[model samples]
Target: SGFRKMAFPSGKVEGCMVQVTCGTTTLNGLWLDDVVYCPRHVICTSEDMLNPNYEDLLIRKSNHNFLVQAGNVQLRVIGHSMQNCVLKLKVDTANPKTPKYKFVRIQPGQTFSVLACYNGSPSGVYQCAMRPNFTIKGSFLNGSCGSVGFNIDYDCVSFCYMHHMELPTGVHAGTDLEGNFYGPFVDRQTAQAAGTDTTITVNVLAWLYAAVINGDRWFLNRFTTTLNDFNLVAMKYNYEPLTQDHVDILGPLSAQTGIAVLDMCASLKELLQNGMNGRTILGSALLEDEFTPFDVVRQCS
Candidate 1:
């Protein structure tokens, strides 16, 4: 593992030094949790790796008097979804196909900041490298430093429901002059070309993050949109929705289906079935206002 560096602003009163400390005394450690003494003016510290060891540092406000708690430190394990997962330190590079990461050490219920996965790591659906799915319970593992991939095999370590979801194929309900079913509805081309589903998934994931990190609920409403889009996609794609009934076409689709339908550009492209929505979020139409819907079956036919 390389040294973790924190940058501070330019300092004044050069040569002025303050006591510093490093330990897992607070929420996982790296999250500005170590400790503080002077208790005033946000104190910041910076340094080069120089083989820096977090275990050897302790902040002495007044040099002599200080406090100590159970041992030196505790570990923090952060929770994240498939997209939020990152890479950690590593060990060897032999056996090219061997799973490189070992295990993640951290407090069972803490959050870790998102860092890019380790370099040259593989991808899977498991959390932290072992699992049925990546969740708070599963520990995190290392990956290819900055690479992208899912540890799907993580299921070997844990077990969860096996159901999965696929992106929805959104449709627009508008009729054309020839009545030949033309819509801005999405197709494989629309989904891939527009790249709308991925963006929406990102937004949905970010909302969950904002809720946990900033204690904000703005993303809550967006959550509804995400669910609805997911449902609509299920309906069009013939997935068994939560409720299994032929009439409940969209209701039986697996909740975890990897599909992200009702996307702006994708939705418009397929439903409009004409051209595309060239506007970005602000420059274009609101998702609800612009994208129309399509009936899966033709009443006349």
Candidate 2:
């Protein structure tokens, strides 16, 4: 199948994890976890992911193994699931260079998190990696993190990992795309340019018509969800007005095309300047007025 409209903050749709916990083991009452191995945007794995699922150890641990993230785990001291215990966690943060585990303490009901790949292991860290081969090179595509260009194409064939494309692959994706571009207009060639005009220059309109005209609530819902994330990053860096601008641009475009969004490729220069990590996962390019949006379509020239 093909991909989706390739929204912002795409890839790795935050979903449930397989939960490779202390895996039938218990230490310091630590038997539960909140891990979500982000492969694409990890600082530990060089923006790439290795099969990050390894058994857990304590500092009481050694040999320096890999850990996962949102590693936000609680010592199982629950009433039904809570107990009494305390443990020091070996953690990893945005910077993997620091050779010290983030020391944190958790009680029976207390909670905290840690990172992996930071210690340089073969697997398990937070989600989001820039490249492929999530679970031990050529093994299995793990992270829901999205893929771009040839990356997605590979996943399209070898095997698809969720969130790599909005539509997924293999059995999960039933095929989908548009434009001379094919499948789910790769957002790499698209942009969120709100326009610099009162004339409302949005030539194409996909999100709006999804609900109003076509009545594709499914599409519209995701479109809104995608835009929420778009606005989030927009304001994450004090760029709220500009996100509004994109919405502003969206209004008039709906008037014309009703819903033909595949052909619009604008600018992401501002957003990129204000984004990374999660931002880096997005396929983007610098555009110069000297050429056209269609000038160098697929190849990232």
Candidate 3:
């Protein structure tokens, strides 16, 4: 996956908590709500298994090294542990000398949330440490905890968390069509240079296709949903007709692709008003650059 695309007027768009797995343990349905556990789960010895003080705390963690745009930092926290503990979250410069600390207490089997804002970007390669202070009945285990490093910036316009494929040699990969670059391409400058929406649309569509080929369902669904929604609104008011070519482009994917096509029809209505342009929106969309029919070929006579 690539970096997520963030639009202007910064705000957080929350999603389902990405699942996490550890050695012999699997924690599901956890949200990235905060910087706490995501700490580490506590395991008791067989001797202390029956002891009330020996609580088995389950903590699952995702990588803390995260990238985001400048502005507010959004977090969603929801889950529980079998033991009462304090998970200390601290954000500091790559250097530990400066730190911003926020503590979240995880009560036995409770679900809560935490919200905080950052003043500037984490350009300094900050570190977010999620330290778990577990209490076995009475005393706190100060030594056991976990931490992760972070690098935050405003440079990335789009990203996917898990990327698995790479472009072959001599194959260019940027431009909405086939450029390797995966950052912002729809701002005023690029828009003006291209003199058309093709630059953005082509590159974006190519990226979408890349996600498809690489099996990045999360990125595909999120990005397509947003794009389809925008196109749908435009088409609804513009009264554009949906042609067979549009159906051809979407038919092989899935039923969701068909739904996306319906939305695309409505998107044209608003996009034109906003001065946006795209082959798809303009009714000249192409699934491939060219179509080579078998009938056109001749033998090597």
The top-ranked prediction according to lDDT is 3
What's the best-to-worst order under lDDT? Answer: 3, 2, 1
Candidate with maximal TM-score: 1
Total clashing residue pairs per candidate?
60, 36, 39
Angstrom error at residue 102, model 1: 30
RMSD of 3: 22.1
Residues 174-266, model 2: lDDT tens digits: 011011112222212123222111111121122223223323222222222244554454344343222444455444444444432322211
- What lDDT tens digits, residue by residue, belong to model 3 across residues 182-277? 232111111212111121222233223333433433322222324455545434443223334434544433242333543332332233444333
**TM-score for each of the candidates:** 0.18, 0.18, 0.18
| Backbone clashes counted, model 3 | 39
Candidate 3 C-alpha error for residue 152, in Å:
2.9
| TM-score for candidate 2 | 0.18
lDDT per residue as tens, model 1, 175-280: 1111111123211112421122211222222222222232332222222234445556545533223122221332212122222332221333342233223532
Off by over 4 Å in 3: 1-43, 46-83, 87-95, 99-301
